[PDB]
Design an enzyme around this catalytic site. Structure first.
Site, mmCIF file in Angstrom:
data_model
loop_
_atom_site.group_PDB
_atom_site.id
_atom_site.type_symbol
_atom_site.label_atom_id
_atom_site.label_comp_id
_atom_site.label_asym_id
_atom_site.label_seq_id
_atom_site.Cartn_x
_atom_site.Cartn_y
_atom_site.Cartn_z
ATOM 1 N NE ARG A 73 -61.942 30.146 -44.123
ATOM 2 C CZ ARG A 73 -62.251 28.854 -43.983
ATOM 3 N NH1 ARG A 73 -63.517 28.440 -44.087
ATOM 4 N NH2 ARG A 73 -61.287 27.969 -43.734
ATOM 5 C CE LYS A 219 -49.837 28.732 -36.353
ATOM 6 N NZ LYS A 219 -50.815 28.002 -37.205
ATOM 7 C CB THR A 277 -44.281 28.450 -42.234
ATOM 8 O OG1 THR A 277 -43.713 29.768 -42.212
ATOM 9 C CG2 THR A 277 -45.311 28.274 -41.099
#
Lengths: 583, 583, 583
Positions: A73, A219, A277
């Protein structure tokens, strides 16, 4: 007849006992808990509800725990919002600072060791991209050229387009999150940002401590993961393809081709794959999905996904049930119109030769050729059910197991509908249970062909090592069959020649005492023939073989025992007669 | 490793207990008794000898009874010999007469109804041919043009080149000969001059009266039989191809192609075929066969014959043993150099889709792919053995049976080596017996792969309906396997790092306690690795997966229990360790 | 290396000479003019621009004219907007009326004769569906049950889900539109709402009057068209698959499977297919397409489309160039990663046996096996090009033609890159031109293999009936080759034994005078050998054959003529030596 399994993310929209019931009824097979958000307190609350509502409705639903993962981040930004001009420059400090169009900080301090001049950097899920001009290791600052001028809020993500991003496999939080999964015997752990085998093994070493037994599903969100797909699967129990996340680091244009090749590589090794998704995202807001979205889901199936996942649609969407119901419908339709010959033909070439796979390919071809109604797979772990599921046969798969957890392990596997029957010991019982279980599902009745695969003796188990083909009983009569063919048609019990004189079409199998000269003209018009007694060269037997009609002779009390006008099947070889349609 | 079965005609040269022993030892599988000659008294004498010498040597030999058949002979001839000029005429009387260059009689009075003007007639096994000029039904005499001037002795045979010759199926004699077969539980009846299904059914109605159970094998010697091959087989248990007899009615030139196509049609339906006559005929006189003869026998095998037959060679030849020994050698050699991939590939396309055949094709492919040492076929009747034998796999077939007759029924089937073990009830016992029986043959040991096919439950039996793949025990150690591969190689128990320092080549699987940093350089030079204890991310485990070496961890007491320098096989999946070579 | 052709709809966003240039440079192969909108005046203006900018840039672009078609609109509605409740009823008048929630009119007065009770009716591109309750033929009104309550503007479309909708094949307008096409020698006519052969023939009779020669491509938008796909293609020159339009009458869920099967049925007959609509629709607004869209385009290619179409993206979108550039990129990428072995293997089975197809399958296999750089197809009409293109080979296709229109006819065909060279007469010239044309494209140079297919003699033409394989010159030296192999590697001209003594690696072909005993040790270390003179058993020749090295002997002046250190290829058979890499 459903095949492709539906994973659903539980959220505020669907915590409700009432709603979790509706979703289960609407096809949900696995419950995703996303540990990006929410407290253990909350997640534990939903787990209890799912369990409770599942075992009231007497259905098998798995729980999937999705980790948050490592991430890069931005730190906090000055005034909350900051801007960046388009032809300008920005400095990315490895040391924390307040955000300015010049000085700007990232939480992954070691970024400076991964990148180099020319490397791209993306901000706020690829909102605005930068590119590395210079690197200074003294000041530990990376000077960059801004390219796509946009705003920049506080804690916004950063992505380095591969770039061996050197984060750890799991965060401290993740480490604690997965022990919470351990605490609730949770069924699946979807691991985030996986990209080398290490990253999984780190989860598996935490599992092996508490002898956990949970399936771990990476993932794969970037090049390093795509690149290492074989070695990751080597070490994994399954896989998840997050397209949204992927579409940041590798171009939207290319993702569908990548997706195909990942799913392919899982089908090869028989690992379940969840396509994740961007499925029906417009059904957060609307009660029906758009065509572009439907297409997407279908391609997911044609590509070969063991499962399909709903994210926000079910967790915090206005239409959740509808989202699942629709997910199902698209599934069933997309499947209905696909070729199980091709599907097999593709897998026959794609997978390797092994003892276990030998039985897979045998059960596959056989099921297709003989048009078997169901493959009943007896498993303790679940690997037979998977060895059968990888070859993708039309036949319904039925995973009979003694283990309540391995039942839930299978809810995500393609084709497999699991039941939990208490274990037999001897093979002969094993087989009879299979048959029982098949029928009790309502999926097979007496006419039907069933293939029973299992790993005997059930002690060692490990590999699956045998198959039996089985016609579900149970011969109405029998005797001496002349010829080798077979047919189905309605009886006409004829006690005399006049008992079928003027009331005669074809399409019937006549049941008389013997054949006179007066019978011989009528017999050749028929489909079949059953005669009361007689031997092999008898008038009754001889006429059938001459005129190519499947017949049986020496049938104890055919005129008394066999009813009139009831549909029946006669088998020339074997010499059996059945209740109505068989094989 | 022998496959193609040897039938031998017993005669004066080989009635001897001493000689029947030598033939059994030289490979004889089936004993032909030719009922063209000899009295019941004689045939019964040989049957006893065969039985006796068989059950002393504890070997399975069948008995075949070959009928004489219907035939069309000439009646007696004047002066014993008569001549016929080459451009002349002859009258063939349907009434008996003494032979003259003009008037000349035949035993089949109804010949006049079968032939017509233009038809050819052949005399003395095709020594001289005639051709029909006129027919007179008043005088019942057929006027013919003689073509190949030759002498004519008394009771010489006549052949009408198809021509639906309307003889009966069996003579009175044959009818009595086959009841003698019924009286001695004889195993096979080769029926002569068969040509329509009737002709077999006539034997089978005589059998069914005494509930006989004997296999019936037609002799197809003319066009009508070639033409009806499919319908004959429909009704038959097997077949014989008499080439000598055939070469009279259809041109030598064409016979080999006809032969091929017959054999082909038997392989299709899984009926055993005996290729008969003109094999090693020069070995009546000589101790070794000629090249042209050897070539013949081989082609027999390449064409696909379940069995090869010796006639006079063994019955009234100076060299009989040698004739069998040599028949064997040619068989083994002609098999050795043929491609069981092609053989399978041919049958895969050729045979039909059925429940029974599904298991055949499964057992076939599987045996080829996994290179199985033996397919143990559990039969009561023999049909499984045959369902397995038609697909012709490299693997040895082993027909375990409770029936002493069905054992002998198999002696003639390709590939199948029968044993007689007393019947189990439950499948689980069935399977374990198989494995037992396989090993007790010396044909499989521990390293080996075995496929076990059978028809369960064994009550109904009828069809064969299951297979199990089985690796013949029995894991020396086990534990937690890392990786999925496998290898074979000799152990090197290393108690310390210096315990393998300077004495190191590759080709070994090291067995230590754990892996230090001092071990890691040596491990990657090796083939495999077995470590004493440890978990999945351990130093020992991790290094194997990195460098692609099959390893096992958590192996109870590897250093103590596993011996030094003994060859071993490690299996990365399953996590097993074997005595020395496996799969 | 581009294969899949790009059709672009010209509109306000791309009328501009400047922009039409950019689209041609960005890959546009065919210009769609949509006659749903715009006046002949406008369409003529764009046609001129395209022609002009095309022949300045010296590129082949076709013009496609897309008709509007028959249609079933609503008539005008009261207040401009009207509403319809969800459980209510509506009357659909065959007579014109102002719109009311009760009375409501449709332009296709004959609707009443096509529907029946139970039939569904859809409004405003399937916005709200109705269902037929009653039919009254007196009043000519169809009473219906409204189902999906929505608003209803004026001239909104109506769709009867098949239902043999009995409109005409073309409207009066369409009939005039297509004569305008005839007037501008326009290349393609995409016919709308086609659904039986009639509908095409109606266009083709208008063409045949003016001897027009234009390709006609139906638009298959409903079941009747899907159902009649074979018979429509029988009569058509190509095809278009409009998905948007289709997705109204048949469920979005099913369309991809239908699409596949249509494209399949075109590939079968070698007719070009355009996959149309919903490709990159978000690129009207955005500068880059979404993943879901990319996926779509790719599947278009994997399904087997000769071409891909942009609609609004290029006609009235903000990003048009980008839309074409991106369309291209996805194409090249989606092709790059597909298996031309499978592609061929699929077509080999799928297409029929014919004289013309024989050459196809020959040129296909051959191109794959010998890895030919280019297939040069000499056509007057274009059918050879297409015969070649249907089998989809890796090799670039090159359609050399004398006709400027048949050039443009090929722009849309898969694989084919057309050139226009003025016609030869004799085959021998034909062949030499081919080779010329291939090289002048820059696509092939000297090392390369070229296959030349054409229809000789070029008078009758019609079918394509021959092929030549051709290595593009031109042997640097030649002589007597020993051995049969070949290799490539850099020369080492050795004038003496010491001229290669200490300066020796492998990977070279030595060029000497002859071989002494001093040369023989060095020669065997090499790849090849060329010697100055000599015969077949010479020291130089003999050594090569012994040690398996491809050699040539008797090479006029090898040491003088052949240069040092230049890469060369030697061919043992033929006895040729080439400039650097060949075959």
């Amino acid at each position: 007849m459903r095949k492709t399994k539906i994973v659903c993310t539980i959220g505020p929209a669907s915590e409700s006992e009432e709603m979790i019931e509706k979703l289960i009824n609407a096809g949900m097979n696995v419950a995703r808990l996303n540990f990006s958000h929410g407290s253990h307190e909350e997640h534990k609350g939903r787990i209890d509800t799912i369990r409770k509502v599942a075992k009231r409705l007497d259905k098998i639903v798995a729980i999937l725990l999705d980790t948050k993962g490592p991430e890069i981040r931005t730190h906090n930004m000055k005034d909350g919002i900051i801007e960046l001009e388009r032809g300008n420059e920005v400095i990315v400090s490895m040391n924390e600072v307040e955000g300015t169009p010049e000085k700007f900080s990232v939480t992954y301090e070691n970024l400076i060791n991964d990148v180099q001049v020319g490397s791209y950097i993306l901000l706020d899920d690829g909102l605005i991209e930068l590119q590395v001009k210079d690197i200074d290791h003294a000041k530990k600052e990376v000077k960059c050229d801004i390219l796509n001028s946009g705003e920049l809020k506080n804690k916004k993500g950063v992505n380095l387009p591969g770039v061996r991003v050197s984060l750890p496999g799991i965060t401290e939080k993740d480490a604690e999150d997965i022990r919470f999964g351990i605490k609730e015997n949770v069924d699946f752990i979807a691991a985030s940002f996986v990209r080398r085998p290490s990253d999984v093994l780190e989860i598996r070493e935490i599992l092996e401590e508490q002898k956990a037994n949970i399936s771990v599903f990476p993932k794969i969100e970037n090049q390093e993961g795509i690149d290492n797909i074989e070695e990751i699967l080597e070490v994994s129990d399954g896989l998840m393809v997050a397209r949204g996340d992927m579409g940041v680091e590798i171009p939207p244009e290319k993702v569908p081709m990548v997706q195909k090749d990942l799913i392919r590589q899982c089908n090869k090794l028989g690992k379940p794959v969840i396509t994740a998704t961007q499925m029906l995202d417009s059904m957060q807001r609307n009660p029906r999905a758009t065509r572009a979205e439907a297409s997407d889901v279908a391609n997911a199936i044609y590509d070969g996904t063991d499962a399909v996942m709903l994210s926000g649609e079910t967790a915090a969407g206005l239409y959740p049930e509808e989202a699942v119901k629709t997910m199902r419908n698209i599934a069933v339709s997309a499947e209905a119109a696909q070729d199980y010959k091709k599907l097999l033909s593709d897998r026959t070439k794609l997978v390797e030769t092994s003892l276990v796979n030998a039985i897979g390919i045998s059960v596959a071809h056989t099921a297709l050729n003989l048009n078997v109604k169901a493959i009943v797979a007896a498993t303790e772990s679940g690997s037979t059910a998977r060895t059968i599921s990888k070859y993708r046969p039309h036949s319904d798969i039925i995973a009979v197991t003694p283990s309540e957890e391995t039942a839930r392990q299978c809810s995500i596997v393609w084709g497999v509908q699991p039941v939990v029957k208490k274990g037999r010991k001897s093979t002969d019982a094993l087989l009879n249970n299979a048959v029982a279980t098949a029928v009790e599902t309502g999926r097979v009745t007496n006419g039907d062909l069933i293939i029973i695969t299992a790993g005997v003796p059930t002690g060692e188990t490990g590999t699956t090592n045998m198959m039996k083909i089985h016609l579900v009983g149970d011969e109405i009569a029998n005797g001496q069959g002349i010829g080798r063919g077979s047919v189905v048609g309605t009886t006409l019990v004829a006690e005399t020649v006049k008992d079928l004189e003027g009331k005669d079409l074809s399409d019937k199998v006549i049941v008389t005492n013997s054949i006179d000269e007066t019978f011989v003209p009528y017999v050749e018009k028929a489909l079949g023939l059953i005669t009361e007694e007689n031997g092999i060269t008898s008038p009754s037997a001889i006429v059938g073989l001459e005129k190519g009609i499947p017949t049986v002779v020496g049938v104890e009390k055919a005129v008394k025992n066999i009813s009139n006008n009831v549909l029946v099947t006669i088998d020339a070889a074997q010499g059996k007669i059945f209740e109505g349609y068989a094989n």
